Design a binder for this molecule. Sequence first.
Ligand SMILES: [Co+2]
Ligand SMILES: [Co+2]
Ligand SMILES: [Fe+2]
Ligand SMILES: [Fe+2]
Lengths: 314, 314
Amino acid sequence: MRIPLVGKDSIESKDIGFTLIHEHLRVFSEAVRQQWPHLYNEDEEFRNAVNEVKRAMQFGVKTIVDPTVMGLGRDIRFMEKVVKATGINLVAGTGIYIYIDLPFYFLNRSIDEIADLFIHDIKEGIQGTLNKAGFVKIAADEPGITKDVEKVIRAAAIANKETKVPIITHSNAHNNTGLEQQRILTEEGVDPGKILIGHLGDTDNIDYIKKIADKGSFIGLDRYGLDLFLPVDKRNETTLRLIKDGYSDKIMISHDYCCTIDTGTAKPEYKPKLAPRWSITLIFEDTIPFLKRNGVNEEVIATIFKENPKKFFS
Amino acid sequence: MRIPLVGKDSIESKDIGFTLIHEHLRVFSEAVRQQWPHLYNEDEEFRNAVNEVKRAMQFGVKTIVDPTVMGLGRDIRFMEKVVKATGINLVAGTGIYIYIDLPFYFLNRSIDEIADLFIHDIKEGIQGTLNKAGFVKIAADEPGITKDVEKVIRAAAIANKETKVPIITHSNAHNNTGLEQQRILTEEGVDPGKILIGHLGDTDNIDYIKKIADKGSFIGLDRYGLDLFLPVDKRNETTLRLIKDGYSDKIMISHDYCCTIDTGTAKPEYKPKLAPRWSITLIFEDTIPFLKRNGVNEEVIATIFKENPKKFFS
Ligand SMILES: [Co+2]
Ligand SMILES: [Co+2]
Ligand SMILES: [Fe+2]
Ligand SMILES: [Fe+2]
């Protein structure tokens, strides 16, 4: 068809339905898990992922896009297990998630070689399977657009131009990285509308957010529940304001929820302080009803959660 | 019952025999291999490692110490297959190899949590097996002693003090990282004689090398064949000079040869320029004959390749 799914036949973008554009079934550091497997519990990770996905589906979520890629512990077989246990439509991606430097493997390797990896996942399959990547994921954060970060961005541009899969980004809302990602990508020939600039919901600086959307890309209001970056109420007020200003055409909403994540920052003790209501269904419980009670009609909701993901992937 | 061996009963340090203190059966980026297995060929890797190890054994090598750890693709089960096929004494280690930052797992984790990983590997076993780590490996390079690099150094100190295993380091011979490693370690109570400061052979700066050796630590003239760092002839001249000045009892010699390595810098085309004679037996073809033809008697050879590793591991 058009959009590849984990453990399923590919579907036309018109079949994507209600979508969570940015959620993680499981995140871990590849090298740590490989070296110290005693730190991880696959049974628990699987239960958590399945339980979260099931609840998401009980609210009418049809499709989840999971931008777990190199550096976040992408595991296609785990994803496949989750799909088999839930029946969710799952879009897996390819890409590289780094903030500073690429792994030593890439020393003296070209941007083209990097893009070749993305294209391989897109055209042939991920990690030895026939499950194909439906988008490319790239990142930048506090360190900004380092040289390796830039190489990855340009490789993503090459992959998009070859295969037409969209590009999802991770960015830091406070240091211009999102705008810079969009700039490099569009200069490399990437259609602005094939890019989702991520984590813009971490700021209430609406002029910045509008600037990215106005240049043609989707804007990721995609960390609902992560109060340590920005509280739910402030995200809500920002979201509502953008909608009132007519930006529904570019808005994408999600939680960036990790059903399991191995970082020290996570960990139960900090959750009450850092992300008390963080989960894969918070927007159904809080955000969406908030918007409706403030005059946002169902047609806008559908644009955000059905139409935008549809355009993104077509 | 003193030095743990992969796939073998432990041996008394005095039985270690002729030792290559720093060689790699295989090196790769964990994240890259997990994400793009199509880039690797385990058959080739296995055959290369076996062929190299048994040629080293024909030259009388009894023990190989392999400091492949997290970040370099440590794989205890691959190491076991190689031991089974060769009968070599192989010492595996634990540790973390980074130049800048730790994997995201370590965000908000203490130096003690890191040290616990090392101790686990030393006391319990590596990657779910009963093969135990016989030393700790740490690293620093161009970027210098970063905050995360220093945490790993301090974690290694804790591991050594708890378990008594020695510490092998990776350094950049031109920026003082080696001296710093020694400083921090010793300041944390590590016996300087339980430290090997690596890659000092990369420079002909005899004074720097001597200062480290004078402070009580072993010095790694350990990249023989890697011309891109320093040609064989200049290495030999430094080595001979050092021995001439009475540093035999601090010198350790190796190739840091990677029977297979995935980095772009490696790779066929660049070999004839970067490392034409690089292999696990270059010192038997070149270095050792050069030393012996220049006044180095068999006692000094035995000291570097048998006594020093013995002391290091006891
Ligand atoms: Co992100
Ligand atoms: Co090294
Ligand atoms: Fe994410
Ligand atoms: Fe090495």
